Design a protein around this ligand. Sequence first.
Ligand SMILES: CCCCCCCCCCCCCCCC(=O)OC[C@H](COP(=O)(O)OCCN)OC(=O)CCCCCCCCCCCCCCC
Lengths: 49, 48
Amino acid sequence: AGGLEHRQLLDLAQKHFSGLSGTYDEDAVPTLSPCRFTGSQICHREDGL
Amino acid sequence: AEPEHDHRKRMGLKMLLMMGLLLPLVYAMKRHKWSVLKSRKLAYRPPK
Ligand SMILES: CCCCCCCCCCCCCCCC(=O)OC[C@H](COP(=O)(O)OCCN)OC(=O)CCCCCCCCCCCCCCC
């Protein structure tokens, strides 16, 4: 973001990022599992504060 | 000597049935609220 043409950013991308692995592993693609929310409570009692 | 005999026995039956309902339900309400405390876990981490 700033004073720059989108063209030059794409050129620099193909110039300095083409050397990057775009081929994932056979079955090692990470997938985010949903995270269980839990109604709960945590109380760190510290009266010195 | 006890004209209320028959009516009292009918009431006694209704009292036992309602108590057989209300006692476990009210017991369940007690444990429901108290479960917050009965499963609470404590840990002590003093500075050393
Ligand atoms: C101004 C009012 C002041 C009231 C003060 C009352 C003090 C509390 C005394 C507690 C009495 C226990 C119930 C008596 C049942 C009875 O005796 O009822 C007899 C009746 C049948 O009657 P029936 O066969 O004629 O058919 C009726 C005509 N259709 O079924 C019962 O058993 C119901 C009772 C179920 C078992 C008891 C459950 C206790 C719950 C507590 C609720 C208390 C309310 C508090 C009110 C102040």
